[PDB]
Amino acid sequence: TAANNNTTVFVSGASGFIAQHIIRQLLDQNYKVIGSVRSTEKGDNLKNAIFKSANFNYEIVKDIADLNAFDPVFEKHGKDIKVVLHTASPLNFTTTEYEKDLLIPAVNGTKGILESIKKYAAQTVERVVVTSSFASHTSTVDMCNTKGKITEDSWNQDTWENCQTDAVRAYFGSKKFAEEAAWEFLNKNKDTVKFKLATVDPVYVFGPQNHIEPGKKVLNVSSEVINQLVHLKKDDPLPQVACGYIDVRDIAKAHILAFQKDELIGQRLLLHSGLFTVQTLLDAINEQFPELRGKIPAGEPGSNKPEDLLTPIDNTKTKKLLGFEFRDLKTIIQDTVSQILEA
Ligand SMILES: NC(=O)C1=CN([C@@H]2O[C@H](COP(=O)(O)OP(=O)(O)OC[C@H]3O[C@@H](n4cnc5c(N)ncnc54)[C@H](OP(=O)(O)O)[C@@H]3O)[C@@H](O)[C@H]2O)C=CC1
């Protein structure tokens, strides 16, 4: 606790779902934290209402797509920042402007923050963790091949051009190219910068919000999947959603281990606990919250098993490297849905 509080951690996109959980666990370990936010309203909310700690401060970085967006942060604080967790990237399916709104901010946000480290903190930052995604390991078009296999070594095969069929496949591409850019940065700057890099690459991230916001009927994208199911009417049509799941608090823990442990240097950490279709989620919600039974859809129990749909995922290497057991779906669903209901 004494050694940790000598260390300042910079976290991009501090107001987001995953980043708040990261910052929560950083403050639990007595680290000092600087987070970037896009507005004073968001920054004040974090410092005044959520963390309430002298170990948390914020800075405004309005748009990560911008040339030199992170230069003022590292000019001011570069001498004190030993760890950088770059988590900020647009996750939104509501745009048709795939390059302007997804691909370019993802890539230039990642290139930009690393260039700013080189410019103002080349010998000060020891460790960087980039939040990548399962999307960087597979395109949407290769996610549902039961005869394939995804591992830490798998890369999304899409091109800048062909991922632009729709906002989901384009967002998947944005993660791929941004992660590629982070490793390429070290490829060309091995002798210019001290920091070592690792990436945390999650599947769909569920779990409780770090802080309930009274008037938010729309959560972040991954969390809004469960929010929708809880509020569907019994006869409503079912969304189509299928992937791996992982709990947000396991994601936060993995980000912190990824800068503390030396065996995680240079690793792509594939964070994944189990497979789901919407039926998997409906079965779990109905089972664990019987007060929703007959109020939300039941789907067709016994149908649409994710094993018969999705490409298998082998992340046994990541599990051994991290050395902790991931929360299972029943835990995730209990913690997530109970918080929604309590609000
Ligand atoms: N949730 C999931 O299932 C997964 C998430 N990820 C990655 O995790 C990270 C966080 O996503 P998550 O927490 O899930 O979703 P959130 O939407 O909660 O967090 C997104 C964050 O990115 C910030 N942001 C987006 N675009 C910009 C921009 N152009 N300039 C500055 N800040 C920006 C948002 O700022 P504001 O708060 O102002 O919008 C927000 O803080 C992202 O890199 C995402 O790709 C990876 C795999 C799965």
Side-chain angles (χ1 to χ4, degrees), residues 1-191 193-343:
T1 64
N4 288 347
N5 194 258
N6 296 329
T7 288
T8 297
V9 190
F10 177 75
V11 183
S12 71
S15 49
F17 171 60
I18 289 173
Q20 289 201 22
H21 273 285
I22 288 169
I23 294 164
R24 178 69 263 149
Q25 292 185 26
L26 284 177
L27 300 157
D28 290 345
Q29 294 194 28
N30 207 30
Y31 282 97
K32 291 196 173 304
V33 174
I34 302 173
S36 80
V37 293
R38 306 177 84 166
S39 77
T40 299
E41 175 172 338
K42 279 152 188 180
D44 280 338
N45 187 48
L46 282 168
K47 195 173 165 50
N48 296 334
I50 287 166
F51 297 122
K52 313 178 188 296
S53 173
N55 288 329
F56 179 74
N57 286 288
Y58 74 90
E59 301 282 350
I60 296 88
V61 179
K62 279 165 141 152
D63 188 355
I64 61 182
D66 188 302
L67 262 69
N68 310 290
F70 288 99
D71 282 357
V73 159
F74 284 84
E75 191 278 332
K76 183 186 284 288
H77 302 280
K79 293 182 183 292
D80 304 318
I81 293 159
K82 284 193 177 86
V83 178
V84 172
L85 313 180
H86 178 44
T87 81
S89 194
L91 174 59
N92 169 297
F93 301 146
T94 296
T95 190
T96 59
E97 278 56 56
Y98 307 133
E99 287 165 338
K100 184 173 198 271
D101 289 341
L102 294 167
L103 296 163
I104 293 163
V107 172
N108 275 7
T110 304
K111 290 180 159 181
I113 192 168
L114 300 178
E115 291 281 347
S116 294
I117 288 168
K118 185 206 205 191
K119 180 172 292 186
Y120 292 126
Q123 303 300 320
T124 294
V125 176
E126 295 162 11
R127 291 293 274 276
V128 173
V129 187
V130 168
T131 311
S132 177
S133 169
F134 174 77
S136 300
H137 298 262
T138 182
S139 173
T140 52
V141 301
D142 294 305
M143 294 187 48
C144 307
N145 178 3
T146 63
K147 280 77 177 175
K149 169 198 181 223
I150 299 164
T151 76
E152 287 85 0
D153 289 332
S154 304
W155 280 89
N156 180 334
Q157 294 283 311
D158 280 355
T159 68
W160 187 270
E161 287 64 43
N162 71 17
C163 76
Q164 296 187 49
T165 65
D166 62 79
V168 184
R169 181 175 189 186
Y171 161 78
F172 266 59
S174 79
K175 302 304 300 174
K176 177 207 176 158
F177 301 119
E179 194 200 320
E180 279 199 319
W183 296 117
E184 170 56 27
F185 178 98
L186 278 183
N187 181 354
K188 299 299 293 295
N189 295 296
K190 279 200 108 193
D191 302 278
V193 308
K194 165 205 273 179
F195 76 79
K196 291 302 184 230
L197 172 70
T199 68
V200 169
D201 311 347
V203 289
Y204 277 51
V205 181
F206 299 140
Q209 304 289 305
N210 171 65
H211 177 83
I212 62 167
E213 293 287 350
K216 181 181 285 291
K217 71 179 181 66
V218 182
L219 302 173
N220 53 290
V221 167
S222 65
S223 298
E224 186 60 15
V225 166
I226 298 192
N227 205 24
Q228 189 177 15
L229 297 182
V230 166
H231 292 102
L232 283 176
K233 293 181 181 178
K234 183 67 180 294
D235 275 10
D236 280 340
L238 288 69
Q240 289 71 240
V241 174
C243 199
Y245 53 85
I246 188 67
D247 187 276
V248 64
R249 295 160 288 184
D250 294 339
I251 293 311
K253 182 172 195 171
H255 275 83
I256 291 161
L257 287 173
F259 76 88
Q260 294 176 333
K261 303 309 189 157
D262 301 334
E263 57 268 34
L264 305 194
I265 289 164
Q267 305 306 307
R268 299 179 80 208
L269 304 166
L270 181 52
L271 265 290
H272 162 74
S273 182
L275 307 165
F276 82 91
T277 64
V278 163
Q279 190 67 49
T280 315
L281 305 180
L282 285 174
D283 291 349
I285 295 167
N286 278 311
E287 166 74 68
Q288 296 171 229
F289 294 87
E291 63 263 59
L292 296 176
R293 291 185 73 101
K295 304 198 178 46
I296 70 162
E300 302 266 8
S303 72
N304 203 13
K305 295 154 188 246
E307 292 62 38
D308 309 327
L309 176 58
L310 291 162
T311 311
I313 292 166
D314 184 334
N315 65 335
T316 62
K317 183 44 165 293
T318 292
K319 294 185 188 186
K320 195 189 160 144
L321 290 177
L322 293 182
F324 75 91
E325 311 314 299
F326 303 151
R327 297 167 158 88
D328 58 24
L329 184 63
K330 170 186 183 170
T331 293
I332 292 169
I333 288 297
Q334 192 71 50
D335 290 353
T336 303
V337 174
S338 61
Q339 184 192 53
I340 291 165
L341 290 192
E342 309 278 4

